[PDB]
Design a protein around this ligand. Structure first.
Ligand code: NA
Ligand code: NA
Lengths: 91, 91
C-alpha cells in the first residue's frame, strides 16, 4: 500500500473500534462521536486556540446525540478540528 | 499523540507535499487532485468493484480541472473512494 493508504487503514480500524460497540456496526451516534473525538483528538483539541470551534461542534453533536453518522461524516468533522488546530496533532 | 493523531499527521503531510507544488501553498487544482488520487490511492481504486464510481469522481475533476480544493475537500474525496472500496486500501 502507499503511505496514505496505510494511514487510512489505521483510521478506518480506529473508527470501527467505536462503531461496532452499539447498533449498526459501521455507524455511531453523534453522542458516541463526541466521546471518540474527546479521547482520540485530545492533543489536537488542546492545540485549538479558539475554543468556540469545538464548543460549536460538540453543541451540534449534543443537539442530535442519537443521530447516526458514518465514516465520511466522522472524517469530515475530524478535518474541521484539524484545521482549527493549525494541523497540530502533537502534545 | 494518539494513534489517530499520528495517522492524521501523516495524511496532512502528504496533502501538503502536493499542494506546495504549484500556485497557493495549501490548495491544489482538481486536475492535480486527480493525479494525487490516481497515485496515492492506487490500490484502493483497484479495489473498487463499481468502476462507475471513480469514473464519476474523475469526471467531476476533469470537468472543473482548474478549480482549487483545500485539505477539507481532499479528505471528502478520499472518503468517497474509500467507501466505494468497502474501506480496503491494501493490494
Ligand atoms: Na454502531
Ligand atoms: Na498549490
Amino acid at each position: 500500500s502507499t503511505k496514505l493508504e496505510e494511514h487510512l487503514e489505521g483510521i478506518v480500524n480506529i473508527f470501527h473500534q467505536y462503531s461496532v460497540r452499539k447498533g449498526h456496526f459501521d455507524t455511531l451516534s453523534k453522542g458516541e462521536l463526541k466521546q471518540l473525538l474527546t479521547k482520540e483528538l485530545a492533543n489536537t483539541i488542546k492545540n485549538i486556540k479558539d475554543k468556540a470551534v469545538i464548543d460549536e461542534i460538540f453543541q451540534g453533536l449534543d443537539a442530535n446525540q442519537d443521530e447516526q453518522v458514518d465514516f465520511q461524516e466522522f472524517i469530515s468533522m475530524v478535518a474541521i478540528a484539524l484545521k482549527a488546530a493549525h494541523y497540530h496533532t502533537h502534545k
